[PDB]
Amino acid sequence: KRFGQNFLVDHGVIDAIVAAIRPERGERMVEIGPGLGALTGPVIARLATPGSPLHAVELDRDLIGRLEQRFGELLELHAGDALTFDFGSIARPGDEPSLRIIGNLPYNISSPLLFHLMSFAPVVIDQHFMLQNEVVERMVAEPGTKAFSRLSVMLQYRYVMDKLIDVPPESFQPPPKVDSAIVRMIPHAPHELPAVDPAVLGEVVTAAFSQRRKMLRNTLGGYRDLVDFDALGFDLARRAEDIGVDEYVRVAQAVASARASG
């Protein structure tokens, strides 16, 4: 649970995070949750020039005034909740992906925000976040492992992801009681995504993860009239938490096929 504010202060860790991101001049980048500017400053130093600011999203008026005072027109801050922000508004015109996203997300907002950002994946070059280690473990989790979840499946479907750096509590003033980590996310290109209707994948994953520790025979039981998964060789004695992204794609392909006409 977020208790007050925890600001990153260790200079070595800050510089390591910047080296992982590799912000460069010419890049369109937005930072979510700049805090007191621990990453904002170093990123601006590498990436911002007059006419090409670093973008940021923040709601706290005290933090906004402090940032604008410190960085002036090198920062372009969009005042509001990131969870309700149309990130599309700050992509460059054109068909090529153009937006780099970075930030530091508290625990509560991590899942909702990661899900919100999925709709902007086509205009996104990459994402780098500082999150609690528990969250990062879930994003990159293998099937059947303690941390494997709905989030793991939907993000692994859409992005290539890598845990890059461990960030211990002493990195922060005051230190929290949790470990953190930096994770990179790169959206698959359209031709690299599996041939599946993402709406049907979402539907299936939502059903399975209703109770991730129960047998699929129960949690995909709403599909039992439509598709006989057992007849197709899919073992329904397994649980949602045991099944990989590739298998979920196959289930969704089976469901779409069962519904097909023409």
Swiss-Prot record:
Subcellular location: Cytoplasm
Enzyme class, UniProt record, top EC level: transferase
Signal peptide stretch: none
Chief location: cytoplasm
EC number per UniProt: 2.1.1.182
GO CC entries: cytosol
Entries under SUPFAM superfamilies matching the protein: S-adenosyl-L-methionine-dependent methyltransferases
Keywords assigned by UniProt, alphabetized: Cytoplasm, Methyltransferase, RNA-binding, rRNA processing, S-adenosyl-L-methionine, Transferase
InterPro entries in the cross-refs: KsgA/Erm, rRNA_Ade_diMease-like_C, rRNA_Ade_methylase_Trfase_N, rRNA_adenine_dimethylase, SAM-dependent_MTases_sf
List of residues binding S-adenosyl-L-methionine: N6, L8, G33, E58, D81, N104
Recorded family membership: Belongs to the class I-like SAM-binding methyltransferase superfamily. rRNA adenine N(6)-methyltransferase family. RsmA subfamily.
Function: Specifically dimethylates two adjacent adenosines (A1518 and A1519) in the loop of a conserved hairpin near the 3'-end of 16S rRNA in the 30S particle. May play a critical role in biogenesis of 30S subunits.
Protein name: Ribosomal RNA small subunit methyltransferase A
Organism name: Burkholderia pseudomallei (strain 1710b)
